[PDB]
Design a binder for this molecule. Structure first.
Ligand SMILES: CCCCCCCC/C=C\CCCCCCCC(=O)OC[C@H](COP(=O)(O)OCC[N+](C)(C)C)OC(=O)CCCCCCC/C=C\CCCCCCCC
Ligand SMILES: CCCCCCCC/C=C\CCCCCCCC(=O)OC[C@H](COP(=O)(O)OCC[N+](C)(C)C)OC(=O)CCCCCCC/C=C\CCCCCCCC
Ligand SMILES: CCCCCCCC/C=C\CCCCCCCC(=O)OC[C@H](COP(=O)(O)OCC[N+](C)(C)C)OC(=O)CCCCCCC/C=C\CCCCCCCC
Ligand SMILES: N#Cc1ccccc1-c1cc(-c2ccccn2)cn(-c2ccccc2)c1=O
Lengths: 49, 140, 49
């Protein structure tokens, strides 16, 4: 029957933010907002009490 | 399941528990003001308030990046109230401002006390709004 | 490098204003940071192809 011919896939050259790829982008967004999260809680804990 | 939006609701239960503690301390400060005092409740209030904005200002940029448009929209009426008290009416001040040099003459003393129960009523409803949509995004 | 050099020689012949030397130092440093981005771009363009 009728089939599809594509080029056989390759090593697929990296982007700019390819170094971020071992962790999903949903992890990196949680890392950034947990960073401000623990920094505000450090500030709340150290200023008051 | 745990997701980034579910973490944006977990991270705002923790900081709205600070926002209610700013306001319990804010209703006691004006009640103890009427009993006695100006220069100390100038200084004790003035240090408190800028954390209360930017923690809520954190929530605006946190639910914007989480794509939570109802939750970002419900923080809008408290946000644009906050821009007015710092860009156009933080009356002259110039130490930080707003609960500063302008105390008695007693007309702002009634305006602050109506605000101080209006902050607590919004924050206690925000706490259960955040606790509901935490359980919503986790279970679903 | 050519901006930072002609602004270093002004700083040698008219030292009554001293700020000629510090700003020419900034052009000497913004130049080398433009080599590194260029040489990273140059090498990474080879390795991609
Ligand atoms: C907190 C302070 C400390 C850190 C400061 C950060 C400063 C440096 C940050 C960024 C500048 C460096 C890189 C510039 C980013 C845009 C260039 C670019 O090519 O980005 C591409 C990205 C997507 O990348 P990809 O991996 O999917 O490639 C896919 C390739 N394929 C198809 C082969 C798989 O898409 C995009 O544009 C994404 C949108 C770009 C957002 C960055 C904004 C850059 C503007 C100014 C930089 C600061 C100047 C300082 C003065
Ligand atoms: C100079 C700073 C880096 C610039 C960010 C690069 C982002 C773009 C990179 C490549 C382009 C491809 C992006 C397309 C894929 C996701 C789409 C997106 O919307 O693009 C932004 C995402 C946000 O993530 P999302 O998957 O939740 O969006 C889900 C959105 N939907 C449902 C549409 C998928 O990607 C993200 O920005 C997550 C990455 C966040 C990077 C910050 C962490 C780096 C440093 C960490 C150490 C410091 C912190 C601790 C101290
Ligand atoms: C020391 C600590 C390290 C500091 C590093 C900081 C860098 C990263 C910080 C924040 C992340 C910036 C980007 C976050 C993106 C939110 C993604 C998300 O989870 O939401 C989902 C929505 C849906 O995505 P879409 O359908 O529109 O894309 C479709 C893509 N396509 C065109 C391929 C069809 O994404 C949206 O647009 C949501 C609406 C707009 C959200 C992006 C606006 C950024 C606001 C505040 C961050 C300041 C940026 C400074 C750089
Ligand atoms: N290779 C590589 C590399 C080196 C340093 C930091 C990150 C990477 C990288 C990691 C990943 C990845 C992905 C999933 C799980 C674990 N790692 C992917 N890539 C990459 C390589 C080619 C094209 C696009 C991304 C990468 O370039």
């Amino acid at each position: 029957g009728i089939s599809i011919m594509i080029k056989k896939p390759q090593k697929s050259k990296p982007g700019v933010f390819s170094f971020l790829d071992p962790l999903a982008y949903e992890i990196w967004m949680c890392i950034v907002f947990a960073y401000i999260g623990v920094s505000v809680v450090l500030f709340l804990v150290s200023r008051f009490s | 399941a745990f997701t980034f939006a579910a973490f944006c609701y977990m991270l705002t239960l923790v900081l709205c528990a600070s926002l209610i503690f700013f306001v319990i301390w804010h209703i006691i400060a004006f009640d103890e003001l009427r009993t006695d005092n100006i220069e100390r409740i100038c200084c004790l209030l003035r240090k408190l308030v800028v954390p209360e904005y930017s923690i809520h200002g954190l929530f605006c940029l946190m639910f914007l990046c989480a794509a939570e448009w109802v939750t970002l929209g419900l923080n809008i009426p408290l946000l644009f109230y906050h821009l007015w008290r710092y860009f156009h009416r933080p009356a002259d001040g110039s130490e930080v401002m707003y609960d500063a040099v302008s105390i008695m003459n007693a007309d702002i003393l009634n305006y602050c006390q109506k605000e101080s129960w209006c902050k607590l009523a919004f924050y206690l409803l925000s706490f259960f709004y955040y606790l509901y949509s935490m359980v919503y995004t986790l279970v679903s | 490098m050519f901006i930072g050099f002609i602004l270093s020689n002004i700083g040698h012949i008219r030292p009554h204003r001293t700020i000629l030397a510090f700003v020419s130092g900034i052009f000497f440093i913004l130049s080398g940071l433009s080599l590194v981005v260029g040489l990273v771009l140059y090498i990474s363009s080879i390795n991609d192809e």
